Scaffold this active site. Sequence first.
Site, PDB file in Angstrom:
ATOM      1  N   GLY A  30     -34.179 -13.450  22.087  1.00 34.25           N
ATOM      2  CA  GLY A  30     -34.992 -13.074  23.397  1.00 34.25           C
ATOM      3  C   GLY A  30     -35.321 -11.571  23.408  1.00 34.25           C
ATOM      4  O   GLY A  30     -35.976 -11.129  22.182  1.00 34.25           O
ATOM      5  N   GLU A  31     -35.247 -11.020  24.451  1.00 29.04           N
ATOM      6  CA  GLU A  31     -35.759  -9.328  24.757  1.00 29.04           C
ATOM      7  C   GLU A  31     -35.159  -8.661  23.287  1.00 29.04           C
ATOM      8  O   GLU A  31     -33.850  -8.471  23.380  1.00 29.04           O
ATOM      9  CB  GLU A  31     -35.430  -9.027  25.904  1.00 29.04           C
ATOM     10  CG  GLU A  31     -36.102  -7.659  26.259  1.00 29.04           C
ATOM     11  CD  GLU A  31     -35.827  -7.442  27.852  1.00 29.04           C
ATOM     12  OE1 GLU A  31     -34.518  -7.663  28.172  1.00 29.04           O
ATOM     13  OE2 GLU A  31     -36.517  -6.737  28.377  1.00 29.04           O
TER      14      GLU A  31
END
Lengths: 359, 113, 57
Positions: free
Chosen positions: A105-106
């Site tokens: 993800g991020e």
Amino acid sequence: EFAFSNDVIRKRHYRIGLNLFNKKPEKGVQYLIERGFVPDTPVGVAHFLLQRKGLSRQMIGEFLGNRQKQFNRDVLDCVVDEMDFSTMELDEALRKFQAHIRVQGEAQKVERLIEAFSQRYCICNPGVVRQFRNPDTIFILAFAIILLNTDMYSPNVKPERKMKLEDFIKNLRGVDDGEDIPREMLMGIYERIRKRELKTNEDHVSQVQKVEKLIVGKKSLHPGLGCVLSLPHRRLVCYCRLFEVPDPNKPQKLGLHQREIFLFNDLLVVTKIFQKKSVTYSFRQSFSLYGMQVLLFENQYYPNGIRLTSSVPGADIKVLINFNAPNPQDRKKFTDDLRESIAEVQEMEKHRIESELEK
Amino acid sequence: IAEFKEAFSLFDKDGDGTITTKELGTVMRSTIDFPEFLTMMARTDSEEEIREAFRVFDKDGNGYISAAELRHVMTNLGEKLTDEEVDEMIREADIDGDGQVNYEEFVQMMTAK
Amino acid sequence: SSDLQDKQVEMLERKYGGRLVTRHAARTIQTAFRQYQMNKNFERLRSSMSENRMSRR
């Protein structure tokens, strides 16, 4: 003075705390703490996240990867302290870490997770660390291993663009304060990743995703299922075979309108078998549980009838669908599960109304 | 053209229109029937797919996307980006600063080898 | 509510075409962007090795 008896209501509120975590982790752990399901300490929450089923490993990672909040940081510290990476290769240790926690993800959250992981690896393996000129090389290499795993297995990196062994090695050239990581270390890591993609352990989201695949089929600029089933909080409750009844006041042939029902904690999905050889399904309809009511009926034509109605506050009352179950036991089991899930959703929405009417 | 039919036929030893799966790799480097094999031969780079993906959100074929619209889609659909991720995206993708995203430039910014 | 968000997502996806086409376009953009950010942050991290991250304080 003693432990709370785990009755129907207490179990329901526990499942609500898990739902809230899987939607908004900080609100979930607050809900679970204030009801005594988890101790109000970083270590208590850390062991809860590692040990308790019903938590989305995606959302565990989002919670632990938060670098701004002190509580999250302290929980992540306790999470890695619970793991022993002693005498493991760095990629083996990282595989063990990411088996519990989705490391994806991020980029800022991934970096935060890898940082805590790497600090713990260094504590567990002082001899490995001393071989390097800079202990931060461990953290850079652990980040590179995450990058490599995505590169090697992500369809969005074409095979002609994927890193071969020498690309992986050369990209790390000089990172240890101007020196190379020992070539053979990088070579063993690359081959272990080539033999085994890093995969996170399954959770309830995995299992809903398998149901999505049974309903779609085998597909593309338009993959998947129109209905978004596999949200992080959604879990399968039960599967049931029932017969749809367009008109309870008229008879119909035995076996007509057969449906395969998938009840989730907040959604009822109606499918019809598509092919069997092992079974695939055609999506027909879904129904939200909020405002739903479950009626039993018996008449001259249907001994095991179920009618589902919709009674949303501020709205009128509407019949959603009628069924006839194959037998009374099946009707009892399904309608009991359905009623419980409706009660759960009603407390969810009730909790959310009080939340908004105070913020 | 059917130059691949001649390499297929060479591995079709009984002339029944099939090649073995053992040699299935050996044929390409030069039971499975020919309709299947003609597909594996016919069976797009990242740059183009990303351009096409942005074009879906440029309904009027304008060549730009509104920053508020790009944010709305990025944070709500698919693998939901965070707001700080979208802030980074808009910083590099809004070339002029008027709130309109030049996605064609951004595509190459990303896939800059 | 939860039903409201699901209908909003549905309408957002239909606004740009078939739902699955819109969803896959968004994921295509998001996946490229997240790998781009990972590559950049890796270059950022190797460019500053004198912070002693591995000492937990």
